[model samples]
Target: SMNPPPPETSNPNKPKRQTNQLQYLLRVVLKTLWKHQFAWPFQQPVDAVKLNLPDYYKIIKTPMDMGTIKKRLENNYYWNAQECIQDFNTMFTNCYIYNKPGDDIVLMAEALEKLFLQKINELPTEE
Candidate 1:
């Protein structure tokens, strides 16, 4: 897990500390990398390597939609309810991906926005 620095060691713990955009970005990149390594589930057993990771390295690791709280936090303000509903409505049309193709692309995006918003709303917001 991407542990935040201990309060005594972190300047960000001070309420008066101004958030630095670059530092925040670097933090997430490192955190996301950590999650991809030890957190994300990939138990289907790809025949490429023999298990117990930090040993078997890979060349391709695409960022996933599910475990990205950083993105949700960045886009929180513009996200809303309708965005959630519309996106859910178009996950699939048949055996192939995309329901109506280009037509329903908006829905998934809206859902992404909505899902993030919900998480943000549910969390204990800073006062």
Candidate 2:
């Protein structure tokens, strides 16, 4: 997760706002992961969003349910958590680095799944 560093810009005075934000989110996510005690290599039902995401989930639908999620993923899709992490690496690259998209978003889906599974296991689900 912490493998890639933030993106840099040519003009030093231009200010690396994108890199700063990416670094900030990286810190926040890692902080959350550590606080939850989730480790590397999630497996089984704890796996990240897989390669074969889903037919209905990937396609554009009416509005509610699968369509909504599909629309979002279509905007920007990644096979797994690792892919997401890598994209974060080169996110600010080219031109979007400084003037990145002006929209709020969430990352680290796979990481969260691992954390969710860990937490659920601590409770009595069926027993």
Off by over 4 Å in 1: 1-102
**Residue-pair clashes per candidate, as listed?**
3, 1
List, residue by residue over 42-84, the lDDT tens digit for candidate 1.
Answer: 2122223333333222322222222233333244311333322
Instruction: Enumerate residue pairs that collide in model 2.
Output: 92-97
Tens digits of per-residue lDDT for model 2, 25-112: 2344334443543322211111113533343222312112112222222333323334334432332121122223542212233445
TM-score of each: 0.23, 0.21
What's model 2's lDDT at 69?
22
Q: Tell me the whole-model lDDT of each prediction, alpha carbons only.
A: 0.30, 0.30
